[PDB]
Amino acid sequence: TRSSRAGLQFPVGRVHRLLRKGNYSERVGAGAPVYLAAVLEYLTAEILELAGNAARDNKKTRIIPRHLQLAIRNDEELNKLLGRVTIAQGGVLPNI
DNA sequence: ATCAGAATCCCGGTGCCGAGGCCGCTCAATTGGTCGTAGACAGCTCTAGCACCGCTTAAACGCACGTACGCGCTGTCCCCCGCGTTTTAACCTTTTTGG
DSSP, rough: OOOHHTOOOOOOHHHHHHHHHHTOOOSSOOOHHHHHHHHHHHHHHHHHHHHHHHHTTTTTTOOOOHHHHHHHHHHHHHHHHHHOOOOOTTOOOOOO
């Protein structure tokens, strides 16, 4: 599989097919889906790292939307990235 | 009815084939940088004054804190219905002594 060749866990074939069927360009090079999969995997790893930290901070072993909201709004770079999104059941940060 | 497990089929991966998109080189010449001189309106330094921001006092009145009462999403009382057995009716049948 093309994920194994790149040492990845995200799919390369699926992403290539979505880029192909998304009406983005006439043709798609072979180095774009690998790079994009790597970026997405890095970003999800960062998100899940901070959300797991936030869930342990609450002494829970399973991540809920509240911990995702806390991880997002507590990280400056992520909170700047996800500045317009609202998370259902995410709540708000404690701020008086 | 969702969740876990068995069977298979279709979509990701291998194989091979073609055509062109784009990399590369080379050439043109526009425009962007670079400087220099001259002019003068704009910036600036400063002075001076006052008006507006900020602190302080007062008033009150209208939100919060609190106890008493209100209301449409959920608990009791009943208008409505299909269906049962019943009540009521028009009808048919049979026979009218013995010798």
